[PDB]
Amino acid sequence: KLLEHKEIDGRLKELREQLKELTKQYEKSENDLKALQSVGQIVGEVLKQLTEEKFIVKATNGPRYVVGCRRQLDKSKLKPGTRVALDMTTLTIMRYLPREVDPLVYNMSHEDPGNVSYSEIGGLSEQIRELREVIELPLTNPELFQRVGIIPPKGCLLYGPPGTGKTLLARAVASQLDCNFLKVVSSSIVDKYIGESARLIREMFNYARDHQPCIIFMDEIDAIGGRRFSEGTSADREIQRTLMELLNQMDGFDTLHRVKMIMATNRPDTLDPALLRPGRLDRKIHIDLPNEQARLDILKIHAGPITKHGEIDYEAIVKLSDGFNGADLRNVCTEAGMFAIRADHDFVVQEDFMKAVRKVADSKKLESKLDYKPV
C-alpha cells in the first residue's frame, strides 16, 4: 500500500538520476559548441618593443610581423623575450604565456642532483672542515666580509685523486650546505659556439643567483665532447679563454646572493696561476688517498644498503684489496652482490665480498680512460 507507493517513488527517483545524466550530456554538448568558435593563436616570441603601441615579434615558424597589443595585455610583462599569442588573422598580441621545453637549458638549470649522505665515502677531514668553513662564512654573513672589505672568496678547488673524491663527494657538498647544486660539466655550456660558452655560464650564474643557498660546482670542467681543446691550429684553448672570462664573471659583474662559484674540480690538466691568486681561488682543498682504516669506514657506508650473512669481517676484506677508490669499494659491494646472486643467496657471506675484492684488486691493477691531472 503506502510502502508499495514509496517503492514506485524510488523508481521515479532512479529515472530522475538518469535525467540528470542527460542534462550533463547537454551541458557537455554546449561546452563543445562554445569551444568550436575559438580559432587558436600563432605562438611567437617578442623580438623587441618597437613602440608602446607596436612590438616587433617573430613567429616560431620564422616569418616576422610587427604586431600591436590587444586590451589589458600588461605591456610591462610583454617585455622582449616573452612568448606571446598572435591572432591568426589580425596578427596582434592576444595574451602573454611563457612555456619553453628548454631541454639544453634544463641541463644548464637544476639537472645536477645532491647526495643526501654526509659521508658517502667518509674522508670528511677537511671536506666538512676547510671546505665548509670557507663557503659558510660568506653564506652566513656576506656583510661581515664587507666590513672586512675583502671580496668573499668566489670559489675553492678540490684537487684530489680521481673517483675517490671526484665520482663521490662531488654532490656530498650539496648536503653539507643543504641545497641543490649546479654542475658545470661544460658539455651543455659548449654547444655550437665557442664564444657562447661564457655567455651560457653567465646564464647559469644568473640561475645560481636565484637561489642564495645553491652553490655553483665546476665539476668535470675540462670534460667536454671528445677531449678538451688546448691551444692548437685546428682548435685553440677556448676553454682557457672561458676560464679568464669566468674570472671576470666571478668578481665584480656577477657576484651577489653570497653564491660561491667553487671550481672544485681536479679534472682540468692546467690551473691558471692568476686564478690561484687570493680572490679568484682564495684557498685550495686537497682530497687525499684513503688511509685503509678510512676505506673500512667507506666499505661500511657502502655496506649499509646490503643484506649480509652477518659473519662478515669488513677489515679482512678491506685488507685483502687496497682499492683506494670509493667507487672501487662500492664496486666491491656490488660484485659481492653478484657473487651472492650466484647460488641464489639473498645474504652476502664474507667470502663473497673477499671474492669480489680479489676481482676489484685486478680492476685496481688495470685502469683506462684516465687523462685528468690537477696542476
Added chain:
Amino acid sequence: SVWFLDHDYLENMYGMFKKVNARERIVGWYHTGPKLHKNDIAINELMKRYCPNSVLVIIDVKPKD
C-alpha cells in the same frame, strides 16, 4: 498590464543565434519609446528571469541632438 512576450520566439531565436556565436548570450532587452512606460518594470521582471543581470537599453530610433 496587457503585455505579451513570445517564449518560443525568445527561446528558438536565442538558441539559433547562440549557435552562430558562443560568446553571444542574452544580456538584456532594448525598447524605443523614449519616455519609459510603467509596463517596463513588469517586462523587466520577465527579462530578469531570462538573464541573471539583464539591462534595458532605451535606444531612440529617431535621433535628436
